[model samples]
Target chain A: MQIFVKTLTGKCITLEVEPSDTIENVKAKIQDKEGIPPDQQRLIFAGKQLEDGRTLSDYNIQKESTLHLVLRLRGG
Target chain B: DLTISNELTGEIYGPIEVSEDMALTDLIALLQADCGFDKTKHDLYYNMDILDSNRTQSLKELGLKTDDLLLIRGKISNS
Candidate 1:
């Protein structure tokens, strides 16, 4: 399945994944494609934060789902 | 990737392939160039929702898919 991750600047990145892939895996894939570190990435779907241990299926994510990507500020 | 049309004239354009990363303004520019829409005189709509052309948003941000429909309607005059 393919999912979309969008940044604050309106840049969208596409990632391919399986239903069983965990949120952490999604973050890693985002990192692989865009070079944004997983630690600094926060993926939100349906207005909820996706936990690292949870699978895409667990959140009922389907093909072509759009997820918002927010970055953690380093200063904090 | 979507179908776009002029709402008033019933003129259809696209199933145009689009980069999900491209900003909304880019798509508006495409309409201006290829589809012959004057952005200043038209408003873009998705499911009857007016899109803010001035905002920097992607189609992905608007949750658009390949099967979605976008319409270009003339801006309503207050006069």
Candidate 2:
């Protein structure tokens, strides 16, 4: 399925991948495209942080779904 | 009291009375239209996980407190 990825700063990119694509794999792709480290990207869907090593199908991510990519703030 | 902040715009809007009886949907009426955002395409949300099984939450009931800066974000345009 194709998914729309958007950063909190509003950088958007669409990736077409199978339902089996792991969240970590997508993060790697985002890193390649946006230059943000994988550790810094916190992929949020429906207001919850998505975990790595999980398949897109595990989260019920649909085609054209907008995955919010927020940077994990280091300090409080 | 309730306050709203635009994470990207560096704008802040105010100390308005947000009673526990106030409807979450009605919250939009109190902020954005008065500022710069087109309220129709946006929503006010907290970084906190304030939702449950239903829509029975008021601002305070949602665990939102005074001086709490909420994010006013727009619908992510899918392309």
Candidate 3:
């Protein structure tokens, strides 16, 4: 399945995934495409965190789902 | 007053009269009619977050202010 990724600045990209893929894998794919470290990315869907161990199916993520990528600010 | 910008195309429109009490759905419909923005295909952003309230909030409720910049961009479809 394909998912949409959108950044805060209004940039967007797409990625391929499966229902069983881990959230961490999503981060890895995003990092590979955007050079945005997984540690810096906050993937949000329906206002919930996309935890590393959770599968996409756990969150009802289907094809064409959008995972908002919020980049954590540097300051505390 | 508000200035709406098409962030993707760099097209800026309006310094038009507005009210903080105006419904977002009404505003969006106005945008669609006057500016050619498709409600389903685009979204409005303020303060770096997409205004996702589905017409439930007023402009002030959305944290918008006079002369604030409202961005119109393609919707991040999670369909």
**Deviation in Å, model 2, residue A44 alpha carbon:** 0.9
Q: Which stretches of candidate 3 lie above 4 Å from their native place?
A: B1-79
Sorted on DockQ, highest at the top, how do the candidates line up? 3, 2, 1
- Provide the lDDT at A46 for model 1: 57
- DockQ metric, candidate 2: 0.02
Best by TM-score: 3
lDDT of 1 at B48: 48
Error of 3 at A65 (Å): 0.5
Mind giving the per-residue lDDT tens digits that candidate 1 earns over B1-79? 3445553553445356677787777877887787676756766655446666454567777776544555566556410
Give the per-residue lDDT of model 1 (tens digit) for A1-76.
Answer: 8998666444667889999999999998888888988887877675557889899999899999877666653321
User: What is the C-alpha lDDT profile of model 3 across B1-79, one tens digit per residue?
Assistant: 4445554553445345677777767877877776667757776656466666564667777666533545566655321
The models' CA-based lDDT, in order, is 0.69, 0.62, 0.69
Stretches of candidate 2 off by over 4 Å are B1-79
Query: Least accurate stretch of 10 residues (summed lDDT) in model 1 chain B?
Result: B5-14
| Backbone clashes in model 1, listed as residue pairs | none
If the candidates were sorted by their TM-score against the true structure, best first, what order would they fall in? 3, 2, 1
